[PDB]
RNA sequence: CGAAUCGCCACUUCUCUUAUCUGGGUGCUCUGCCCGCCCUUGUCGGCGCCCAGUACCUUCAUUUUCACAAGAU
RNA sequence: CAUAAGAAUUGAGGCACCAAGUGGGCCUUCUUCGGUAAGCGGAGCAGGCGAUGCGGAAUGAACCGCUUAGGGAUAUGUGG
RNA sequence: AACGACAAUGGAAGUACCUUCAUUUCUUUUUUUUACGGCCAGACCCAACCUCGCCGCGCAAUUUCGGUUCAACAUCCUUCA
């Protein structure tokens, strides 16, 4: 056996984080967002109590070394939601057949596809919030936003997968409801 | 030792089995609980395939007589232990007849003692503390295994009362702490009292 | 045992010949020990060895009685574990002991009554000449024998 | 309060490799020992299995206070050498086996006839 | 909280070699699982190389050069007095005691036990507060029962007439007591 | 290291007793062999090949065990030839810093065994040398070369049952991993 | 008498032919939550805090602690 | 019979009378033929099996170890 | 008053039960168990199997850059060499 070791966490600034357990509890502007990690524990060492946290390893295996990054980033992104949130833009896109999506709020209702077939419905999970916006030339547009990209995204990606089609060629297929901007709610501090 | 009850929270399945196997063999009625936290290696996929395949067989004419699959977490283990025991030994059988396991934990019986686990059977201790692994209940869930939900409930209760108890002890134990003290260094000196270095 | 040796030798022999007309002793003891009687009639009980009767055979033991509950007795060494504790029995006489006394066909007897008592006395001063065969801890008094576990070969003392 | 000065042990098995077991020589693992050197001390010593007789009440004899009686009967044998780090000891009888299922049963390990 | 870092000039515990529990300090780490260790003990520990599996770091870390000399070591580590500091560590008790325990004798033992016996019935239960606290089940209960026997005495079973009869009974116990001892 | 597995002997030998070689000319190795029986076999063997000479004709004067410097690590470089894979001689260069060259040879051999799968005959270990610069090549030796190299490490053993106390019957007390 | 299932425990002792029970939870990442902290703030090093671990009960009332009657029949 | 230099053995050798029982083999390291092949066929050497069991290879005629009075006590074998 | 997971009888082994045989026997006799020259084996405890020779060690020395520190310098030496 060859030493990686295990441990905990890297850091930036204005947002509190757990620093303890498998679980990072990140707290900032937009609240607090927290995740529990499995085998993802790794050479921590606090560099400042409040001001510097890293986890950038001593020895171990190849596979180990990757994770370290993947770990920071994601929790960084825990910070991101907590700070500047996520805002996904989607637009329904269709040409031969018009397509309509509303938002119940608690759930998203999707109409029309190909004359409509089934009604695609997605319940609005927590903090992915959904807006059909339309003025300002907001346009066939859904907006998913909240302070967890992964969720905002997951729900989103899910949506792209909710607008799938089969049988009788991608070379005539396009139409569906596609991701148009995955972002933050804004720039924020 | 009498009336034995072992706590299987986080114990390496095979090893624990085997270990027990010898124990049973050397003859003693022993008991397992926290059986649901008995452990299986790696992935549920892996655990399933194995079980599935096990479950899958038949005794073709009368499939009702090849192997049966009491899918309790207990039953898994124990049967393993039977497997690790020599079944058809008339002696082992009696041995079996001795052996006790309940899934989960029927409560009242752990309270002045019960601190008991068994050597090698400590799953992290056995498993590399960085290798992946999967939990028994999870398996039994995977093959259904009915009571899981219930079991949960039951567990929560168990903890509570135990906590209740525990708080109570907590109180006395300070008194118990408070056990002298005072005149107690007037332990001797002739023929070399170092009770002061010994237990005091 | 103990130190530097080939001992007790004298520039003429390795070599031969044992006990003519003197008893051989238990190849590890010295009198005046505290023994704990292992088996039979008084198993677990704390008594004192006086001497092994005339012939190669058996230690006379006594606790004295009130410390212990010890009747004095012929015993074999290989029925006792021999303490590290030791006293002189210099004042004790133990002179008369002869095993015929100990035949139960010859065992209560006045002889017994006197002799143990005599003996007991002798022990007693010696014991008092070095405390805590009785005092407290006994030695001799105890109740408790062997706890489950750490058996004698682990009991170094 | 009592005797209790032998260790319960359990008579495990006959010596063995594969086709060839030794009914003549039996194994006990002596509680708290499993410590072969330690066991070396124990060597020779005579071990007892006391059983109760179930059956027909015998004690032919009187011994015991006299007219001994019992239906409880008890077997002695002696230990031959330890093995295993975990202190197996092998044991021999002056006779031949200790019943024929007293195996697995718990058994008593005296510490004397004494060698101190 | 993973923390007793090996740091050359760290004090490590010999855990299962025969050479267990002598002491010495890191004079090298020879890599993965091995150490180079040194002490002033005249006979064990010289400069040994020992397996890391076998060692426990003792939370005395000094400064000293990585890879180093006895002579330097002997004195600075003497100066560090960490042996002593380690000596004062509690962990230590039972095991230096263990060696002792091996070699006691009975009387000692009895006392040693007796110490706690002395306390036992004598300084916890005993008294009066904490035995007005838990108390022992019988106490607790006797007290509690006494509220539930405010029930007889005080209350809604019992004792305004029948205890008067109890008074009759009480003497009756004594009437027999007196009689029975008088035969 | 030092589980001192393998031994080191120096063999010094000579060609022909025969005046057909009046005056043989002498050979040396310090060689890691686990005994001298081997050692001399090996010695002879290159002599039987590399030098073409049968042992049974010629004469080893001496085979004598050869000792390392002292008490501390020196940085060894190792050079290797292995013949296997049904494809003969192949070379490798590897790096160990320890206190013993022997331990290095040793460690190589397992290492090859584990690590290139190999088997011992089939290797001729060419050489081991203490490396002086701050290099010392290999990343792992360099890795742990650091002044102020130090560490954290956790999560393993001590034998859980045992005769040094105590098998199945455990635990009397309560659990975690312990440290 | 110089070993000899022994006389106990015990048809109301039994998971068993001879310690009570020291009890509950959790992670490796902690020897007390331990903790907390400080500090070239590191791999840390130092300091601090608390009682809490410092596994752990063996029954006369003792045997903190004098001590005493009684074996042998 | 020395060399000054180069055996070991030799639990006898010599030597013979006369009668049985056998002639389908089969298995193997090694060499090797036929044919794609074949647990195939077909030879060469040695060894087995056959015609033996014991101990080893969860299972095996021939693989491993090893052969056998009857035991006892001990230690090994292969193998764990 | 014998027994039964289910092969069946089978070996071997011991116990239980036995209907059991034959033998020997104590107020100077038998019986199980301790114990015992010289023996007659096996295991523990300390001594040493030598020795020429390096090895090194020390010193200095060159090369030789590393830990300290925020890093450089000290500290050309942490040290390998």
Swiss-Prot record, chain E:
Alphabetical list of CDD domains matching this protein: KOW_RPL14
InterPro entries: KOW, Rib_uL2_dom2, Ribosomal_eL14, Ribosomal_eL14_dom, Ribosomal_eL14_KOW, Translation_prot_SH3-like_sf
Pfam family, one: Ribosomal_L14e
GO molecular function list: RNA binding; structural constituent of ribosome
Family matches, as Gene3D superfamilies: 2.30.30.30
PANTHER family: 60S RIBOSOMAL PROTEIN L14, LARGE RIBOSOMAL SUBUNIT PROTEIN EL14
This protein's record includes keyword Coiled coil: no
Free-text function comment from the UniProt entry: Component of the large ribosomal subunit. The ribosome is a large ribonucleoprotein complex responsible for the synthesis of proteins in the cell.
Keyword entries, A-Z: Ribonucleoprotein, Ribosomal protein
Designated name of the protein: Large ribosomal subunit protein eL14
GO CC annotation, single: cytosolic large ribosomal subunit
Signal sequence extent: none
Organism expressing this protein natively: Trypanosoma brucei brucei
GO biological process: ribosomal large subunit biogenesis; translation
UniProt record similarity statement: Belongs to the eukaryotic ribosomal protein eL14 family.
